[PDB]
Amino acid sequence: EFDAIKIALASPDMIRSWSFGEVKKPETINYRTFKPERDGLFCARIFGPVKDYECLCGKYKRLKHRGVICEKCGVEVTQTKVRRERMGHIELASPTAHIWFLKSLPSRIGLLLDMPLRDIERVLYFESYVVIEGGMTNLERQQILTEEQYLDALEEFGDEFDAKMGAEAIQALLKSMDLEQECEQLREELNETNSETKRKKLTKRIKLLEAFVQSGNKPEWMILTVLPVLPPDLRPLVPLDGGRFATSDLNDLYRRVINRNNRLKRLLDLAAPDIIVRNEKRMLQEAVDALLDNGRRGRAITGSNKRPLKSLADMIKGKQGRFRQNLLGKRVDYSGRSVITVGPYLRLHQCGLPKKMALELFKPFIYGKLELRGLATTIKAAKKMVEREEAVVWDILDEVIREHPVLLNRAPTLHRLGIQAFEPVLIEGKAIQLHPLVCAAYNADFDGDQMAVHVPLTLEAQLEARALMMSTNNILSPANGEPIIVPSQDVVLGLYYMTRDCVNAKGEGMVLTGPKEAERLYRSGLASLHARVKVRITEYEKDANGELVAKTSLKDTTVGRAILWMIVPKGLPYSIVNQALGKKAISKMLNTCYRILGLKPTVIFADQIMYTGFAYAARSGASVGIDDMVIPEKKHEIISEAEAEVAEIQEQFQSGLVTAGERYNKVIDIWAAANDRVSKAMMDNLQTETVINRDGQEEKQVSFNSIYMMADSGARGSAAQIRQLAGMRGLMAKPDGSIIETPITANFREGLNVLQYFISTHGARKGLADTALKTANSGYLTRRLVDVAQDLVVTEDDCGTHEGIMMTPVIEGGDVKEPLRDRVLGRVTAEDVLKPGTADILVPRNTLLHEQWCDLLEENSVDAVKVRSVVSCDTDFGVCAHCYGRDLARGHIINKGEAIGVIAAQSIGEPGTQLTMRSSIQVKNKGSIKLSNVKSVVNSSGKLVITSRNTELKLIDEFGRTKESYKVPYGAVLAKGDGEQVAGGETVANWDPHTMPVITEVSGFVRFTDMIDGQTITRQTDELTGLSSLVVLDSAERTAGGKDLRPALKIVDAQGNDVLIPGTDMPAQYFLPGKAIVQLEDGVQISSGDTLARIPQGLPRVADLFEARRPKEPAILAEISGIVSFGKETKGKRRLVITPVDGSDPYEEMIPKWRQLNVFEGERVERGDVISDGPEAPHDILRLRGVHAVTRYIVNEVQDVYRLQGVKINDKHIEVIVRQMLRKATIVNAGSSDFLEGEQVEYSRVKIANRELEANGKVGATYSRDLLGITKASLATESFISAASFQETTRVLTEAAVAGKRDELRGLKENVIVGRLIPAGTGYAYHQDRMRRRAA
Amino acid sequence: HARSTGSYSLVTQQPLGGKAQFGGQRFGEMEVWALEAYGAAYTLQEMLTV
Amino acid sequence: SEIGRTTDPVRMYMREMGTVELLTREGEIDIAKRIEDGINQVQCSVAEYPEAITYLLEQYDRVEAEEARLSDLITGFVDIDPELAREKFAELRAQYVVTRDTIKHATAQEEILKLSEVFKQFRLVPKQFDYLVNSMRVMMDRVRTQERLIMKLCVEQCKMPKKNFITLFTGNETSDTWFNAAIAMNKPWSEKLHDVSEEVHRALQKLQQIEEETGLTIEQVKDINRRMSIGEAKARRAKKEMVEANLRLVISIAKKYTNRGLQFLDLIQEGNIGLMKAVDKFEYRRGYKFSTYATWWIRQAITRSIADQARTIRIPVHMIETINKLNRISRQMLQEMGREPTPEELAERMLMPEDKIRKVLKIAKEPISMETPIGDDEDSHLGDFIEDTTLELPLDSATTESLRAATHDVLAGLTAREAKVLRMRFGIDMNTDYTLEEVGKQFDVTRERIRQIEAKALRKLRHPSRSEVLRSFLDD
DNA sequence: GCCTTGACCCTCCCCTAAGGGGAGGGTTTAGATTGTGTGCAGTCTGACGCGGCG
DNA sequence: CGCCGCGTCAGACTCGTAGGAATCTAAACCCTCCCCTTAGGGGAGGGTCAAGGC
Ligand SMILES: [Mg+2]
Ligand SMILES: [Zn+2]
Ligand SMILES: [Zn+2]
């Protein structure tokens, strides 16, 4: 049909060619006989007939006369549907500026004219004149005149010059300007400029003028002289049920425009005084502005409610505009809704659908099969049969729903498992019966939740429901490869109770012929489910081939584990059930079944697990009583002891031994300790207090307490909640967040009193208000992520890149937060993985690291694997299937046509409602030590002194992999020789946290340089030290001289010889900053390593990381590598000069010195190391360290937020969003290219342009990749439709109109807007043969 | 509540809102993303157009 | 200076409106005198052209036999009963005839000026005076447009010097005596237009009638018309000073209409139009103040524009007034009874029948916005509940298609002639149905035979062999 | 059976005599009057563009 | 010319039923145009009913 959408400015002739007549009157319809009035806003002569195939006068009344325009009424005899398509126009009596091109910032009229919006608005409002042309006059072009200046220069310099006011003046200025001449003038002005602010000004204006030259647009079309009128059926005036009329606000706004325009024409006919005509022109301008965008300029016009009228711009923008309410999502037919209940009998692929719902949802199918089977002669006979609900329409309904899936949806659809397809089973209720195992995917409970049903109509939709969306395809999560159709609550409690063992249970110690004998003995009441017993078990294993070989042996098992073995599929080991099965063990059992045997055994296994767990949770009788909340018998004395401690601390505070701060902190500490004591006593009295007799002798076993069994199986409940049931509730926080110093010593088994309950509600309401207010923030973040990543699709199979990220385990301090195996599983290697035994290929170059390769990496010592990433994919407009890796929902490599961007955005945004809206080194374990980035010297006391700020300590095991990683401050003295064994708890590093020491260069003697005493020093004596110290104070502390001039502590030999560096002849001196305390004099020897001077020192976070927000005061990084020097101080901006050795030397910054610097004048810096400290800005990380550094930073900083709440997301999904944030590139040197310098282009565009330029031997452009947040990256897309539908619709449509953009509909949103197959999924083939039957 | 076909709005011709109006279910933006995350292009195209 | 500080056009208007100070009782009088002197100057400049006075005396002799009345020709005299006008018309005719023959040339400037000053006495109705001045504008603008078509062709040829093309063109007025002097320089430009020297004739020889149709010189006509322009620019600059001084009166009146459907600046602009009409119609010789007369026109314009454009569905002025009268009768009956009256008694206090008042009560209601929040929410609006009632149900479309198929089936089971006249008698798969005579003439057969054929075919289709498919498309 | 023929028959639209009734439109109206008139708001946080100081 | 505080702009969950908003306001003239009134008459356009003629 069409292949692109173009947007541009409309000329007056274009606007008159859309129209079918001029709207000349504000009449809508006759009040007596509601036919539309001629020449009005509803006019059948302009806009089309109001009855289908009938004129207005009734003279031509049938399709016999079609297309004939009546000569009496002028109405064309045609369909009335044309009243939705036929526009009109208003010929404006005065030129009126378009408010979008004036007032949507930056102003296009202002930027094109290079006038301030203050001067343009003064001319528009008839307050000032502007000189269109100066002539033989001293007046420059566009010079603004007040009225008196105009009347002076008019009589003084005659009518040689031309000066006007109003939008006729602005229009004459926009018409009189030469765009190409001004482009050349501005370009040669750019070639004369070094000021980067003015250079940005000029490149903005140049690309505006160039967009106007390249487009067909003319500047003067930004001033309206003709006004389009929307078709009247899109602004309908319709009679309501009670005879009242309902209208659009556009009729009010259009009527006001017509009324002020007709009065302006009248006044120009009467030759009114010009104060009246200027007023009418201002009123027509503000009426047209209110029609186009109501509320931008001035106060919003309200009509008859004091509610502002909805303008044309409000129709298409916002959450309730066309795009977001009607185009990006719709209300659909063949859709129902009901409360969901549980069906525990259902199979995983089926739902229960009420017969009353299905009879309506499937109604044309039933009509078709009633007429087809001869049971109805006519669709109306069939309709009456279905109304009467004859007994045969239920048979017809049972055969029309037979293999026909339905989609079930629960809002909010946070991820794609919120829509799943099921085969319906017709039930008799009114409630949908949902399978239990899918509820966790839906986040559904049966406490009043509703779900929507949708009927797939076409064969393709039915086969996508069956093949893509069916719940038996959805057992693995797409966020992480973990099972998402997983047992819970009742199932895991039944499977846990079944697989537990009692000590002296009935039937203990017999020997069973198999699991069938165990079931016989349990059912006949001769053995207990927990009787530990000896069963002959035959288990099958897969050999090297796909063959399944059996082994039979007597296992020491229980009766219930033998019973549970009967439902386990064959390729699985008996050790998978020979344990008590909690939630984790059952999830791992399902994952094991999936990886070993595949999907068909796994869905059968999951159904059998559900049935068995339900059955044996029923058999258990597992109740909850009040005697199950066993309160520890020593809780009262723990509380009495903490009360005695708090009383003695209170008496200490009365006796002045402690101030209120440490007093309060001591009370908080002795109550947190007593709470931990009560919790440990409660859990110890709860977890094993089955004491049981084995042949007379008492023995302890794990407890069959019901509260404990629910908590221990992972069914429901944490230890933190058993603490509130049976322990004490503990310390509560004020709404301030500060802890109330008297805790709830009660639990819920005992009562809380009124005061305890009140201070518990303090935090209960805070949590509930967080839940209520963070869904909006998480939805907004997910929407921004989808709209930044929607266009990313796996388009290629392999891009042949060799880049990638080096995956290592995440180690923060001395904990391994993320192992290598789950950071590298399902990813394609980027280089051959080698053993510690060198040059032997362990894993070849393009291997997808499935579980066997990961076990091979784990049994070897591989600590780092370089893998392929989407940020390093070479594919233009997409991603190859190898840089992505596995589809985590399938378990194999991703397919071409997968919308991995929507999956990534949903995977990140789904857990957002589980996030919150509001010194020395102690090595843990044994292993070798190695340090990195060390500036190391030997102290006089047998030490290692690491005088650096980039060093880090790493603890290696005998395996060879780093297990702990710390990093130590400047001048941290090492208690260890680096490179050999340490022990657990062994202190390796000690330093000063609160003060920064100065550590010397080489051994020698103190010498002084530029420290003129009395002006750079206060020599102060500390009364109990014996030797006085010398302070180098602030700059305002002393007079001119040493305040800015730096004291330099030289080191020389005692014979006066300056000591020279090993390797360089660099002069050994130490320049120290102000606020320093020195304890040294001249003459005393100092070896290398003496410390001479001491200078003393949730969900919003993820949203800030993806928006790439620069923090409040960032870290300061070294742009270029070199040596530090200092320029103009004593302004407030300390001037740092990094001096390279082989580059262009001067590079300065303006560091405000109210942040402590962490660099010295003698030490070098690498590009990007911290000069000052603070939260790093990701733009700086990208510029100075690169793309891999900023993606490493963003994935680590986002997974720190997610791992803290126990949320497991693959970092494929964060790398997808990071790749979509690195989509632009600013050109630094164009070469022989079509780009300017300092111009932001797409990275793929400049990469393709360089591919073509180095294909023709010429030099391509050089660029610097930008980092944009997810809002600025999704607003900077090459598609104006998706950007305008995301947000800021006015800005997007304004820049797209003045630039003359064209949208080729290449992403998912633009094909959703326009009702096409998306270019992903099963529409990927269609778009491929749409583009190869267009490029041919 | 269920609906196969029914009344439609005036300006946009989409189904009406509630079960009092015998209306359709809102297949909103997040459901469209859910269908785009599957490859359900034909299911989506019939939700949007037909 | 307050320039550039506000966005409100009301504040901008009031700001620029207050820079004109109010007039005294004496200021209105001499502004009105300036207006009347401008119009008197226009009239005394009109008097130089005779055919206007001839038309006016034509009008008077038409008043003599009463083809019209002089109450529509003159509003009065200054130094209306029909006896004084006889005296003044006779003395003016005796002046026009005594001027007609005296043509010489210095003597011709005595009688024209005394006729001008004696024609000054007639203060005409605006219609006749406007007709005379517009007639003179048409005469001078057609004379002027051929005057500059003379130069239109001279630009059509070549480069155009007309700095000294005007040297002896002034005064000759009969022939090309000025035209021959242009080639007398023999510069190349003086070539071009001269070979068009014949084509120019019917322009400056159409002067051959008009200088015999006006009697006076070209610049005499042009300069009495430029004196008319000076007089009307004096009268127009004085009307502008009376409108600009009285805009506070318009705001003073318009503030009492502020919430009846129109906005404050809309009311101000309509009242400004009324005020300009009042300035045109005011007579200071009545001794009244300008406020007294101008309030009538300002209120007229404001109330008329409220009746015209305050409502989406426009109610005519007669029904607007019926609604207003009904509303104040309802106010009186609600006060005197403490209870909102019913249309029965509301029709007994009014003079009107009850069924008239019921529709008047149903006629006065303003449309609701379809952006009205239902539930006073902001997510669901009134437009979300309004249904397209012109849509055909898909079961009705499918029934229509099945019925087309069934009638196609039964019409295939008839003779070709009978099925043709039965598809032609009705509009089946044609764009129009036909009458018996049209079907007959297409067959070259009578009307009654076609009636017989179609009645027989219908009787065939009535049989249950051919009817059970179609009987299913009927209801109770 | 096909085809005319003369006589009938139907509805629908316009006409009657002397205005009645009403709708919908114009026009003027002469004591003097000369600057509106409301709110409402317990958002925060980015982010951009600009006067104004240095 | 470069930087800092200020002005401004743009974003911020889907089912059932209730469900809106409620003030304010010429009169006397004149005109044309359209429909209406009896008790049916006249005609145009289009159908219908028995006669037969082949
Ligand atoms: Mg719930
Ligand atoms: Zn018509
Ligand atoms: Zn790739």
Side-chain angles (χ1 to χ4, degrees), chain A residues 100-120 141-142 170 173-174 177 179 182-183 185-186 197-212 219 222 1294-1295 1298-1299:
Chain A
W100 276 18
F101 308 114
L102 180 75
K103 277 271 301 177
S104 168
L105 297 184
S107 173
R108 310 303 161 204
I109 295 172
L111 195 52
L112 203 71
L113 284 180
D114 204 37
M115 275 164 79
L117 187 48
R118 56 174 195 280
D119 292 356
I120 300 196
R141 195 176 193 269
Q142 306 176 6
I170 301 308
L173 280 177
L174 292 164
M177 65 174 304
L179 292 177
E182 191 85 350
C183 285
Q185 172 194 80
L186 280 193
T197 81
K198 178 198 270 283
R199 280 192 90 263
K200 181 59 68 70
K201 206 181 305 302
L202 262 64
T203 191
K204 276 179 57 52
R205 193 164 181 253
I206 278 177
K207 294 194 74 65
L208 187 56
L209 306 165
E210 282 199 315
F212 262 105
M222 299 199 284
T1294 306
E1295 67 179 1
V1298 302

Side-chain angles (χ1 to χ4, degrees), chain A residues 55-60 69-75 77:
Chain A
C55 80
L56 198 76
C57 50
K59 171 176 176 173
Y60 308 89
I69 56 184
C70 175
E71 79 266 12
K72 182 177 185 291
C73 59
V75 186
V77 196

Side-chain angles (χ1 to χ4, degrees), chain A residues 307-503:
Chain A
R307 184 187 39 78
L309 296 166
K310 212 202 192 189
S311 43
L312 280 162
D314 307 344
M315 299 293 169
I316 67 190
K317 79 189 180 40
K319 178 153 190 152
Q320 266 91 35
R322 290 294 109 191
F323 281 118
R324 297 188 45 186
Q325 208 194 9
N326 302 111
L327 288 174
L328 290 165
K330 302 161 149 86
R331 290 206 176 257
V332 285
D333 284 332
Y334 307 94
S335 63
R337 176 180 201 82
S338 198
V339 186
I340 49 162
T341 58
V342 64
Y345 66 99
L346 292 174
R347 298 177 70 198
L348 182 52
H349 57 104
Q350 49 197 11
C351 67
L353 190 67
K355 284 177 176 94
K356 295 150 178 156
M357 269 190 72
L359 191 75
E360 173 70 43
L361 292 172
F362 283 90
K363 201 177 271 181
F365 299 88
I366 300 159
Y367 292 165
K369 279 219 180 181
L370 279 165
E371 302 152 41
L372 179 84
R373 287 209 191 277
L375 307 154
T377 56
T378 295
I379 187 178
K380 274 166 71 173
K383 160 179 216 300
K384 288 180 296 142
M385 294 171 81
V386 178
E387 275 174 21
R388 300 191 299 256
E389 291 167 2
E390 308 194 353
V392 76
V393 312
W394 298 117
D395 302 332
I396 298 298
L397 175 63
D398 274 277
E399 74 184 48
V400 304
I401 70 137
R402 179 162 147 77
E403 314 278 356
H404 198 136
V406 292
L407 320 178
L408 266 63
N409 175 49
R410 203 199 80 105
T413 312
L414 298 187
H415 63 322
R416 84 188 195 187
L417 308 169
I419 314 192
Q420 282 161 72
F422 299 96
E423 272 181 9
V425 169
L426 289 191
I427 70 187
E428 286 284 332
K430 291 202 174 202
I432 304 157
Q433 281 183 355
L434 201 66
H435 197 262
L437 282 194
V438 308
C439 300
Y442 278 111
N443 197 43
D445 42 29
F446 313 105
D447 68 33
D449 297 6
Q450 283 164 79
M451 284 179 56
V453 196
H454 301 273
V455 175
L457 298 179
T458 59
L459 293 179
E460 279 100 345
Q462 288 165 39
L463 279 151
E464 290 167 350
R466 187 160 293 268
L468 316 167
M469 319 184 40
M470 192 77 85
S471 55
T472 44
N473 314 311
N474 295 161
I475 69 165
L476 290 192
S477 185
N480 47 11
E482 324 297 329
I484 194 83
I485 303 304
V486 74
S488 60
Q489 301 199 19
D490 289 345
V491 187
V492 304
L493 182 75
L495 290 199
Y496 172 86
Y497 178 85
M498 165 162 39
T499 46
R500 275 211 46 186
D501 42 351
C502 203
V503 166

Side-chain angles (χ1 to χ4, degrees), chain C residues 128-174:
Chain C
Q128 311 291 15
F129 163 76
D130 211 47
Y131 168 80
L132 267 65
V133 304
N134 288 316
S135 69
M136 205 68 201
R137 292 297 164 84
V138 180
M139 306 213 189
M140 193 273 286
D141 74 9
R142 59 177 273 274
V143 165
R144 206 182 204 177
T145 194
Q146 74 171 355
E147 173 261 310
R148 293 182 183 174
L149 188 147
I150 295 296
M151 306 269 185
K152 182 79 72 176
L153 55 86
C154 292
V155 184
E156 286 284 329
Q157 320 286 312
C158 196
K159 182 263 291 179
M160 187 62 208
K162 66 183 179 68
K163 289 84 172 178
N164 312 317
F165 208 43
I166 200 70
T167 55
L168 71 159
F169 172 51
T170 68
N172 303 357
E173 197 65 19
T174 306

Side-chain angles (χ1 to χ4, degrees), chain A residues 603-644:
Chain A
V603 295
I604 295 174
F605 190 31
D607 266 323
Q608 288 310 293
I609 281 175
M610 197 191 64
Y611 305 149
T612 311
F614 278 155
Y616 285 86
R619 291 288 291 236
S620 67
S623 186
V624 57
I626 206 66
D627 292 354
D628 298 1
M629 283 158 262
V630 190
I631 307 193
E633 301 73 17
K634 54 170 297 215
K635 178 214 188 189
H636 79 297
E637 71 181 3
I638 297 170
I639 293 168
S640 297
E641 288 166 348
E643 277 178 355

